[PDB]
Amino acid sequence: GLFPYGPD
């Protein structure tokens, strides 16, 4: 994903 940058 975009937020958070950690997970997708």
Side-chain angles (χ1 to χ4, degrees), residues 2-8:
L2 302 178
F3 297 95
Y5 295 95
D8 293 88

